[PDB]
Scaffold this active site. Structure first.
Site, PDB file in Angstrom:
ATOM      1  N   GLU A  35       0.814  -1.196   0.000  1.00 59.62           N
ATOM      2  CA  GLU A  35       0.000   0.000   0.000  1.00 59.62           C
ATOM      3  C   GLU A  35       0.843   1.238   0.000  1.00 59.62           C
ATOM      4  O   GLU A  35       0.555   2.169  -0.724  1.00 59.62           O
ATOM      5  CB  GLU A  35      -0.940   0.018   1.200  1.00 59.62           C
ATOM      6  CG  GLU A  35      -2.114  -0.957   1.100  1.00 59.62           C
ATOM      7  CD  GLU A  35      -3.213  -0.515   0.147  1.00 59.62           C
ATOM      8  OE1 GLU A  35      -3.188   0.638  -0.297  1.00 59.62           O
ATOM      9  OE2 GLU A  35      -4.138  -1.301  -0.142  1.00 59.62           O
ATOM     10  N   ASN A  46      -7.076   9.708  -5.970  1.00 60.09           N
ATOM     11  CA  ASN A  46      -7.972   8.825  -6.681  1.00 60.09           C
ATOM     12  C   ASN A  46      -8.826   9.621  -7.662  1.00 60.09           C
ATOM     13  O   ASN A  46      -8.922  10.847  -7.571  1.00 60.09           O
ATOM     14  CB  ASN A  46      -8.833   8.049  -5.685  1.00 60.09           C
ATOM     15  CG  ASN A  46      -7.996   7.229  -4.697  1.00 60.09           C
ATOM     16  OD1 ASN A  46      -8.185   7.320  -3.488  1.00 60.09           O
ATOM     17  ND2 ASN A  46      -7.078   6.417  -5.217  1.00 60.09           N
ATOM     18  N   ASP A  48     -12.122   9.709  -8.043  1.00 59.93           N
ATOM     19  CA  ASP A  48     -13.257  10.363  -7.449  1.00 59.93           C
ATOM     20  C   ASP A  48     -12.827  11.610  -6.682  1.00 59.93           C
ATOM     21  O   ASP A  48     -13.654  12.263  -6.053  1.00 59.93           O
ATOM     22  CB  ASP A  48     -14.032   9.394  -6.557  1.00 59.93           C
ATOM     23  CG  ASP A  48     -13.233   8.871  -5.379  1.00 59.93           C
ATOM     24  OD1 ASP A  48     -12.215   9.453  -4.983  1.00 59.93           O
ATOM     25  OD2 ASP A  48     -13.654   7.860  -4.811  1.00 59.93           O
ATOM     26  N   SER A  50     -10.799  11.807  -3.977  1.00 61.16           N
ATOM     27  CA  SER A  50     -10.333  11.610  -2.631  1.00 61.16           C
ATOM     28  C   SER A  50      -8.850  11.262  -2.762  1.00 61.16           C
ATOM     29  O   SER A  50      -8.343  11.066  -3.873  1.00 61.16           O
ATOM     30  CB  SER A  50     -11.076  10.466  -1.987  1.00 61.16           C
ATOM     31  OG  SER A  50     -10.813   9.285  -2.708  1.00 61.16           O
ATOM     32  N   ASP A  52      -5.537   8.915  -0.676  1.00 60.23           N
ATOM     33  CA  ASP A  52      -5.212   7.912   0.311  1.00 60.23           C
ATOM     34  C   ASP A  52      -3.977   8.383   1.062  1.00 60.23           C
ATOM     35  O   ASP A  52      -3.013   8.866   0.453  1.00 60.23           O
ATOM     36  CB  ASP A  52      -4.946   6.597  -0.366  1.00 60.23           C
ATOM     37  CG  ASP A  52      -6.141   6.083  -1.105  1.00 60.23           C
ATOM     38  OD1 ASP A  52      -7.281   6.228  -0.623  1.00 60.23           O
ATOM     39  OD2 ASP A  52      -5.941   5.498  -2.186  1.00 60.23           O
ATOM     40  N   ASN A  59      -8.317   6.204   3.176  1.00 63.32           N
ATOM     41  CA  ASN A  59      -9.049   7.070   2.263  1.00 63.32           C
ATOM     42  C   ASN A  59      -9.774   8.273   2.865  1.00 63.32           C
ATOM     43  O   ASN A  59     -10.489   8.130   3.852  1.00 63.32           O
ATOM     44  CB  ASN A  59     -10.015   6.207   1.475  1.00 63.32           C
ATOM     45  CG  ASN A  59     -10.716   6.972   0.381  1.00 63.32           C
ATOM     46  OD1 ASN A  59     -11.852   7.401   0.542  1.00 63.32           O
ATOM     47  ND2 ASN A  59     -10.052   7.143  -0.741  1.00 63.32           N
TER      48      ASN A  59
END
Length: 129
Positions: A35, A46, A48, A50, A52, A59
């Protein structure tokens, strides 16, 4: 801070992650590896909109507030920058809520695709803890 495999394994154990909700230590180390590459400062944007954050790439749409993600629910009630800290506590504490969410560690796509059903034990072998 960029962690070492065993250095991270110990910190997660002490923070109560070993076998948390059924997920042994190797699962958490494996997930952090894919990750964020053991990097507490990692961020990823991301589609959309958002982003991370941190070692466990939590998120911004549901878990933390970064003041730029609409519909931000901020479930762990914490600013996302608190997750980029070299002290994994906040990430660990928020991780616990996500894993208790009902969806388990499936919430982490890298876990699902690269850790789920592998010898996750190999991740903490040779470590003292």
């Amino acid at each position: 801070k960029v962690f070492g495999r065993c250095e991270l394994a110990a910190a997660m154990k002490r923070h109560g992650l070993d076998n948390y909700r059924g997920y042994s230590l190797g699962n958490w180390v494996c997930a952090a590896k894919f990750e964020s590459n053991f990097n507490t400062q990692a961020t990823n944007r991301n589609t959309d909109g958002s982003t991370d954050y941190g070692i466990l790439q939590i998120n911004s749409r549901w878990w933390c507030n970064d003041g730029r993600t609409p519909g931000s629910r901020n479930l762990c009630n914490i600013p996302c920058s608190a997750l980029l800290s070299s002290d994994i506590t906040a990430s660990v504490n928020c991780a616990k809520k996500i894993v208790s969410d009902g969806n388990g560690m499936n919430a982490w796509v890298a876990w699902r695709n690269r850790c789920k059903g592998t010898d996750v034990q190999a991740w903490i072998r040779g470590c003292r803890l």
